[PDB]
Design a protein around this nucleic acid. Sequence first.
DNA 1: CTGTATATTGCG
DNA 2: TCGCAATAATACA
Length: 203
Amino acid sequence: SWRHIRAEGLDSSYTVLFGKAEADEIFQELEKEVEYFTGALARVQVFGKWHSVPRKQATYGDAGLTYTFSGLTLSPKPWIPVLERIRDHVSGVTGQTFNFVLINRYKDGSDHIGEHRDDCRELAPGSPIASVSFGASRDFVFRHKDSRGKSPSRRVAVVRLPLAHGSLLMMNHPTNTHWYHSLPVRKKVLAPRVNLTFRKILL
DNA sequence: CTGTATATTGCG
DNA sequence: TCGCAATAATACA
Ligand SMILES: O=C(O)CCC(=O)C(=O)O
Ligand SMILES: [Mn+2]
């Protein structure tokens, strides 16, 4: 069964792919195998200022591709067994295909990601995004674009969702046209979390 | 009276 | 501790 997350312009689906034992093993292999970007490849530019990202990132996928957000371009690394196994399984469950994965690792509840839409030029038009989570459960927040700021034109409610160990969140079109998402700071969370967002990228 | 868009600071 | 409006400076269209 899928929990359907629906609101005006919001269309997402949530389910648990893996039980505890399997999700533990996958997490441990991710921790062991994934090579994260450092230094110059972990700095972004937002509002005219450069910052080191408050988390760790890695990109895997087919050769040739490119992934640019916030002034930072990330070349994908060749697929490794554990990412292919997760990719293929998501594909078998959803029917959707993927040639790329972005990995965000939050070492604890102080690591986080800011509010944004996934609306890249390099993202295939109307292609779903598969977000698979491992480790600590973290709250994932959807805010509507017209409901943000000083004076909002719309009073659409915020949508909050705990992403569990071994879960899958599907973000279908047009979720990313109208809704920003983020993983806010959760100061009580002491354990790491690894998130995989599988995507379809144009060459 | 009025373009649009975007990590931490500075509040509450 | 949590939420979030303001905004570091441009870069557009
Ligand atoms: O950490 C997550 O659950 C999602 C991360 C994300 O949205 C991104 O990396 O663009
Ligand atoms: Mn995202």
